[PDB]
Design a protein around this motif. Structure first.
Motif, PDB file in Angstrom:
ATOM      1  N   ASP A   3     -22.331 -27.627   6.340  1.00  0.00           N
ATOM      2  CA  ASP A   3     -23.446 -27.654   5.410  1.00  0.00           C
ATOM      3  C   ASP A   3     -24.502 -28.645   5.872  1.00  0.00           C
ATOM      4  OD1 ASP A   3     -21.694 -26.024   4.139  1.00  0.00           O
ATOM      5  OD2 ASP A   3     -21.494 -27.233   2.317  1.00  0.00           O
TER       6      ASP A   3
ATOM      7  N   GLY B 291     -19.306 -27.836  -1.813  1.00  0.00           N
ATOM      8  CA  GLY B 291     -20.392 -26.986  -2.239  1.00  0.00           C
ATOM      9  C   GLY B 291     -20.035 -26.152  -3.459  1.00  0.00           C
TER      10      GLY B 291
ATOM     11  N   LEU C  62     -20.921 -23.128  -3.454  1.00  0.00           N
ATOM     12  CA  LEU C  62     -21.367 -22.009  -2.624  1.00  0.00           C
ATOM     13  C   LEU C  62     -21.113 -20.636  -3.235  1.00  0.00           C
ATOM     14  CD1 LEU C  62     -22.550 -21.358   0.223  1.00  0.00           C
ATOM     15  CD2 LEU C  62     -20.202 -21.323   1.065  1.00  0.00           C
TER      16      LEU C  62
END
Ligand SMILES: [Fe+3]
Ligand SMILES: [Fe+3]
Ligand SMILES: [Fe+3]
Ligand SMILES: [Fe+3]
Lengths: 335, 335, 335, 335
Positions: free
Chosen positions: D24, D130, D132
């Motif tokens: 990331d 995250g 995500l």
């Protein structure tokens, strides 16, 4: 502690010494030239006197002059159901035109509409002369027992009636009572009234005035009327969706201390989104009603179980589990 | 799929083309010299013919020769309730001597004993002439409806009756039926018979033969009898606790295919520890009853909700949560 | 009323104040010449010294001799699991062998089998040295928390152990704890033991001695063994189904005050038809257990709710109503 | 069908191949001069990589500048809790200042606050780098598992955060999650996301954006904020009660397809009367969510029972009566 019945057999004897053998005047409007109608008003009250529970409703003979006004309220108000009335009432009235016998010429007796309500929801109609107690009418309704009258409004006043008659309740009350979740809701109004104080009896009758008797629904988005007295008279069903009265949202506290009259058309109204939402909102109001116990309607023996102990809630809780194990065995059967 | 009723209004019309307008002989033992008793047997058969549900039971006139044998079965068997009978029956028969009107001289009419069972558990007695269907008598039993016979055994046979009469059921069936646990138990026997096959009807009727009709209980340690036919005849109530018959333990499947006769005093008996132990053991047996669905008794409208879908169990489960939300709001009230 | 924990963090302080920082001897058998085994027992005991709840179990080092006697008890008892042992224990042992790491060479640590029990039923093994309070071990088992001993029995006594070790618990207790209804069963014994008095603690540990520790099952008609200590030692697993001990039926009160020793192979055993029937019999025993309140295990926060008031039972029943509205919406989802 | 986890152990395996081992960047704002903060972002991103369920949260070291912005957010936002914040948060933050270790100088580690949520409601914080997948963060939340970030926003932007940090969720999410009703409510948001389609994930995340992340309450009449991100940043907590945004009433479908941004202070807000009313309104919205099944959280084993059959609903329903017979025996214990 105020008094409340326990059986449907005990519903009669302690609510006839207070409501029956009373010589009633004709109407609260004092003085009619209707003495042969008063004798028709006297004989119609004497049927409910010797009536006990379990005995059937004795049928009523009708002359044509109240049949024609039963016809006049029928052909007007059945045409007035496409206007401004609840759609749940429209399918219920269509069931009542097939099952009960709602017609222009023949007024249905109270037995065949009672036999209709036991087959749909389990309500029964009960013949009674007066609305003389606001507690006893509410205390009966907890027993799935709707106090009903056997008389008709006079031919001189065929549209506006100051007292509930068969034109009031057979067209306004019992087509709502054929709904399942309304009948559970309208009972839970009466289920809150057992042993409730006189201001709680008034507050529940204040509540009953605005969400069963005169209550406006909301079906398919559009607002329609589902109140009993709204669907019982000519101009008030045109008045409720008219805008010179105001329609509040249905609230428990705002329907608890709401001022109300009975003669002219009502100003304040309560819009209800559904009969279930009325049942959920009565669940909120019946909780905060102060009472040393609460009651569960035991529907097998059609009685009231006082839950004045944790042990009393237990013998109700197994009454849940004997039919929840039925559901636990039904989910094994189906699949 | 076999046929099963849906409402108590549908209990009559589809169980009288198969059970009624049948010209019955006097007794299954062929040939009596009892023609004035046969016309008494015929008029007592025709009262159940035009009887529809919702109507009360019409009263029965009695001549003195069946009054005296009703008096004979009363003074013997009420004296035989201290001997070998259920104590739950004993306090129930004490309630039957006070509320329903049990005495030596007058036989209680069927309306007064049915109105009794509405106050206790919600059963009702329903007049029927014959035992002509073993399915429909069980199919009505799920509806909290007991098929009952308004006649008397003949004076020539005051003690042993080959057919169930009022001396069978008004002393044997109903004082068990006034118990809350046995009524839910006896209904769950009938609840398994809805839509069940003819060998499942026969499996349940053999089950019904040995835990309702002829079933032996165990209260206060000692073994007593709670069967209907056991508490209906002179010598059999003294026979069931005698040891020349054998009393097995009550089992689900060993009561299903158990052989039985009807004339000789029964050999095999089924000891039940309590009516709840009878209830949970019927919960095990009615689960394994093979069926495309299961049925739930809707005690409000006195009808049957068929659970042939997951959606049908939901509209029962909403009735459970509205029943449980009464209990949760009660536990807020009590305390 | 005695003391009992309320939160899982309060399993630590008031049960280590009485059962921890206690200088323990090696075995209750007086005197071993096994000082290195004493240091092993002392180090294993001080693993559970600073252990608080929420912390994982620290891994245990093992030398050759405890690994070898673990191999001995594993290859004897796994081969004997075909002999007279429960088939539910057999499939649970297969699940343990593929999941937890049950093998001959490596002894599984407590963390992996605890993570397995939080996967299957939600139990957790919790390290403690001594069983010093029979009340506190049961009161932990209320919390779905099994107090468990992180040590091994002696190498000179590989078959009979006078104290529960990992070869006891990891072989007999934990593959029973991976079963759903036996976990709900063994949790209910401790739920009965919360706040119970000293002779009630003795009665419940006495019951636990005969329906969890040494309890015998019946699957497919044939009697097998499901007890913990039965499935923990070599000769007792073949002794319990031999005929020189006597096996009564499992009874609630006859297991409460049943005398028992611990050294000799036990005389009286209790046959259980299923763990569900054991759960019903523990329900009937825990009903009659005298207590000023009751307790419900709230498995969300893994805590204990005192039902000492109808308000507490109400806020317990509200979670039941949320989880039943979950089921009522699921029955709408499926169909 | 979309994929959903089954156990909390299975929650890690299929939500790390899609959310983890991904390199990331620092922030979605492209390009920071914060390389030593990027390695601090990286080592925090790597603590969740070798993380497994049951393995506790490893402690995080903190240098001065992330403590100094933790100093800055704790002085400002705790002063912003008497102003415009929910009082249920205020008693929870007072509970968080006592138990979890909330102070100015020490930013509390994730382990001590996750041990608090298992102590109150049974939630746990789960460290993740995250957010995500919007499905997987919702699919974890049904397991009472809150995906959370062990990093802090940069000191250059200490008041407005473009991404959720420890200052976002330890002050916004977890003091809401300590509520009994909200944790049941926030789970039911995640309980609708199991096997739900990508527009249903988007409909639930737009719902989750407006009734958990940014949702405004109504406590004691006055409107206060209970959203996570509202109680996480400086000016937004004064923005939500200000009138340049508009606060709609919280609705099922008007929160499902409501548009939203993330940078500007939000325009539309959703006033909720209580956490239970949000739980009732999520009961209505997640009912109409189309799905081949529904899912029930089994809080004993901390897992999910997929109800794709009437039989799967039944093994939930025997779990209901097992703890209803706990309540049925509790109402006998108390009295
Ligand atoms: Fe009316
Ligand atoms: Fe009979
Ligand atoms: Fe043990
Ligand atoms: Fe967040």
């Amino acid at each position: 502690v105020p008094w409340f019945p326990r059986k449907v057999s005990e519903l009669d004897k302690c609510h006839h010494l207070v409501t029956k053998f009373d010589p009633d005047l004709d109407l609260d409007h004092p003085g009619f030239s209707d003495q042969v109608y008063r004798q028709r008003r006297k004989l119609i009250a004497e049927i409910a006197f010797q009536y006990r529970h379990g005995d059937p409703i004795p049928r009523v003979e009708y002359t044509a002059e109240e049949i024609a006004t039963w016809k006049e309220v029928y052909t007007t108000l059945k045409g007035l159901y496409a206007t401004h009335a609840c759609g749940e009432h429209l399918e219920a009235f269509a069931l009542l035109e097939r099952f009960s016998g709602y017609r222009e010429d023949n007024i249905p007796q109270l037995e065949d509409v009672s036999r209709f309500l036991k087959e749909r929801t389990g309500f029964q109609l009960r013949p009674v002369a007066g609305l003389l107690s606001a507690r006893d009418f509410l205390a009966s309704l907890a027993f799935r027992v709707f106090q009903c009258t056997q008389y008709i409004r006079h031919a001189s006043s065929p549209m506006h009636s100051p007292e509930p008659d068969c034109c009031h309740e057979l067209l306004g009350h019992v087509p709502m009572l054929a709904d399942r979740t309304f009948a559970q809701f309208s009972q839970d109004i009466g289920l809150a009234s057992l042993g409730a104080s006189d201001e709680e009896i008034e507050k529940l009758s204040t509540l009953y005035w605005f969400t069963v008797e005169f209550g406006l629904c909301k079906q398919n988005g559009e607002v329609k009327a589902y109140g009993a007295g709204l669907l019982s008279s000519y101009g008030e069903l045109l008045h409720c969706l008219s805008e010179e009265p105001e329609i509040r949202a249905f609230d428990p506290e705002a329907a608890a201390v709401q001022p109300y009259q009975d003669q002219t058309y009502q100003s304040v109204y309560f819009v209800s989104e559904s009969f279930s939402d009325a049942k959920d909102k009565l669940r909120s109001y019946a909780s905060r009603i102060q009472r040393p116990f609460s009651v569960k309607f035991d529907p097998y023996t059609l009685a009231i179980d006082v839950l004045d102990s944790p042990q009393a809630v237990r013998r109700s809780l197994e009454g849940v589990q004997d039919e929840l194990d039925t559901l636990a065995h039904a989910l094994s059967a189906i699949g």
